[PDB]
Amino acid sequence: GSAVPFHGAHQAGIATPVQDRLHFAAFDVTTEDRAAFVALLKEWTAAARRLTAGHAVGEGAYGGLPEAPPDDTGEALGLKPSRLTLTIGFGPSLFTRFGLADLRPEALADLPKFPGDNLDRARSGGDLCVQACADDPQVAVHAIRNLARIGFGKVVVRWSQLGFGKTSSTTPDKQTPRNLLGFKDGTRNIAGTEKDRLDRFVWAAEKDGTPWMTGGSYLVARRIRMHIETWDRASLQEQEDVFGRDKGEGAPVGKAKERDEPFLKAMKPDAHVRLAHPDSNGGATLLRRGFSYTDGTDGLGRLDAGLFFLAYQRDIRTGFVPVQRNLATDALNEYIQHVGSAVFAVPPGVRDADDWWGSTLF
Amino acid sequence: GSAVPFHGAHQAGIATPVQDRLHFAAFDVTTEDRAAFVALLKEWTAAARRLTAGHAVGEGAYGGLPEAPPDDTGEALGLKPSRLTLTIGFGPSLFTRFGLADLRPEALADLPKFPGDNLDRARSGGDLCVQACADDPQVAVHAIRNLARIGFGKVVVRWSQLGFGKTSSTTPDKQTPRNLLGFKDGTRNIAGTEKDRLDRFVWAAEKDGTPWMTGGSYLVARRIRMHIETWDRASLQEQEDVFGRDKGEGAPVGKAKERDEPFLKAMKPDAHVRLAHPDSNGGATLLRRGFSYTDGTDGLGRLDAGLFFLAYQRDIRTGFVPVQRNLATDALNEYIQHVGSAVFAVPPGVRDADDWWGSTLFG
Ligand code: HEM
Ligand code: HEM
């Protein structure tokens, strides 16, 4: 029920143990006034310091002047911090504002079009994002709702995504969660304790060419629909062949235990794991941090559900992009469709109680 | 606790303690064959027995013949029972099928049109419902997804609602949850411990007119959108005046503690609690069992949120209808809009390991 520290060299919510729930919001900026946006960033940081400690924003949820609206909307009263993290990111489109054009990081690359894409533009992109992760979905929702309210008049919510359960791990010592295809998802990721791998594959360094981003990371979000009806008709062997792992234990093919290292040549040439593995991608490695979603029905008798994929990396160009390109022939493609997309530069951490989101940029 | 028992004189998921999460599905029937539908009810019941004990349906999620689809889709492997309950209901429209027209309960009344309704017909009604409640949302989702899969060919999913947090209580000894307007919601309800109140206000009795429904209940669902942006601009006093209780403690006006009984005359005439209270409605009393939701954004730059309201009663005509009618002048109406609705007859419980959902209706 405990708290994750908000301050650090890095933002929390990346290497941190993956919490059970997600509320992710993409915002568009409506002010053209740089000072006003800086003011918002500071007010949001202050709010985030309270929220992540389980406290109400501002002057609280009640007990203020009767004629004033409460500063905090109140639906988290009585709850716990619940490992809430709030992680901000800046989209490419933000850099067209506030005289920022020349500070857009080269490693914040626009994604190419990928075969199969059916992207909903209204649920793609965004000038900025806030990732709220917590074990209690109401804590996460409360955070986003209050940050949106604070930003009234300066930002709007472009799109938002609830993730009801995690499909990712940065803690290999704990149980790997399952996605809605019924497979464990997160076995071979990056652990929060793997400081060398995080430096190599996740955190931007000053020498990479964008100083303000040192200690930050780059995020790719992909809303991925699952063709549940088609999947659920497939045989056990078909499903296992798609991935290259068995379903129940989640071991690589021919192995008895989940965390045994794969022998890729024993998997089908189009197996997901074989195509996604670093060895198949010139060493490219991701920190995957996604969650499952369900968004009602298709209007035509079927549940709609999928996976809101999130990947952190030191450079989009050496992380997500090469790996996704190598999934052009993936056997998984029969059963999924990417339907939303965004990229964001996630700045370095809030160093202390005087610091503020985006201070290295602004 | 870990698990809630599935069998009983009553279905679980009504008087039982309110779990943290909800997946609610309304289904429409596609088969015209009554035997085929009875076979589904039995297969569903068997599945529900496994799911509510944390076990996979059928022969499991793996380990079967390689060339066969697994019986269970696998996403609950490694999870806990999570207090899962599965509660089935039958909509008015079901009774137009399978020669049933004359067995529709009179207490399963269609709702009147209410002032301010803006019902999306695609997210209203349904021949059947399954309410899945659990502390782990993936346990609930897995159950709905698997029930839908087992049923496919005989039923489809008309509409689906995830409730990410509860806004209701059947356990006064525990903390009352808050809705997305930030108020405690469930203080004056009907508790699971109030066995006589349940008999008076929640369970159908044999002499009420519909023998097969004895030990069942009638459910009203209302999807209620909240105008969060408008509410959040209202003063603390305005918000407290809307309900009749203070926000932080949730006490009635003029009282110090949440559970102090309300003094209705001290509330505004249009206050929600004053209009909803049994004293204002000829004694009518509900078992409210709803949950919060958020489903993306509106057209227009704002989070989309509300309350998926659920009410159980012994008769829709003497429970939800009079109370909701009395809410015509509610101060709350400024900030809410009913956008989906359905009613269901929730049959009696699955008595034992040989019984099946709906056995008293079908024979
Ligand atoms: C709905 C979509 C997806 C599903 C259901 C899925 C499922 C899985 C599963 C079951 C595994 C094996 C266990 C593990 O995490 O080690 C896995 C591995 C992995 N996936 Fe995916 N995945 C999806 C999309 C993607 C995308 C879009 C990418 C990258 C562009 C990706 C990259 C990876 C990588 C890098 C691994 C680890 C390979 C290794 O080093 O062994 N996945 N995925
Ligand atoms: C989004 C919509 C709604 C919200 C936010 C809401 C909120 C509340 C709140 C905060 C309370 C006070 C605490 C409590 O005793 O539970 C309350 C009481 C109550 N509400 Fe609502 N409510 C809503 C809709 C409804 C509807 C649709 C009905 C019935 C048709 C209803 C019936 C009641 C009843 C019976 C009480 C208890 C009154 C008493 O006996 O003291 N509510 N509600």
Residue numbers in the entry:
A (entry chain A): 55 to 416
B (entry chain B): 55 to 417
Question: What does the report in the manuscript say about this coordinate set?
Answer:
Dye-decolourising peroxidases (DyPs) are a distinct structural family of peroxidases possessing an α + β dimeric fold that houses a b-type heme coordinated on its proximal side by a His residue. The soil dwelling bacterium, Streptomyces lividans possesses three DyPs; two belonging to the A-type and a third belonging to the B-type sub-families. The two A-type homologs, named DtpA and DtpAa react in their ferric heme state with H2O2 to form a two-electron oxidised derivative that is an Fe(iv)O heme carrying a porphyrin π-cation radical (Fe(iv)O[Por˙+]) – termed compound I.34–36 In the presence of a substrate, reduction of the porphyrin π-cation radical results in the formation of compound II (Fe(iv)O), with a second substrate molecule reducing compound II to the ferric state. By using an A-type member of the DyP family (DtpAa) as an exemplar, we combine protein engineering, X-ray crystallography, hole-hopping calculations, EPR spectroscopy and kinetic modelling to provide compelling new insights into the control of radical migration pathways following reaction of the heme with hydrogen peroxide.
The Y345F variant, creates a DtpAa protein with no Tyr residues within 15 Å of the heme on the distal side with the double variant, Y345F/F347Y, mimicking the distal heme Tyr arrangement as in DtpA. High-resolution X-ray crystal structures determined to 1.23 Å (Y345F) and 1.27 Å (Y345F/F347) resolutions, corroborated the desired amino acid changes. The X-ray crystal structure of the double variant reveals that the Asp358 side chain undergoes a positional change, relative to that observed in the Y345F variant and WT DtpAa, enabling for a H-bond network to form with a newly appeared H2O molecule and the Tyr347 phenol group. This arrangement mimics the proton acceptor architecture identified in DtpA, considered important for creating a stable YO˙ species. Not surprisingly, the fastest hole hopping pathways (τM 10−3 s) in the Y345F and double variant remain dominated by the proximal Trp/Tyr dyad. However, in the double variant, a hole hopping pathway is calculated (P3), with a τM value on the same order of magnitude to that calculated for the Tyr374 pathway in DtpA. Thus, the introduction in DtpAa of a Tyr at position 347 distal to the heme facilitates a new hole hopping pathway. In the case of the double variant (mimics the Tyr arrangement of the distal heme in DtpA), a lowly populated EPR signal, with a maximal intensity at ∼3 min was detected. The line shape and position, albeit of a low signal-to-noise ratio, are consistent with a possibility of the signal being caused by a YO˙ species. In the double variant, although the engineered distal Tyr347 is present, and indeed identified as the YO˙ species in the triple variant, it is minimally populated.
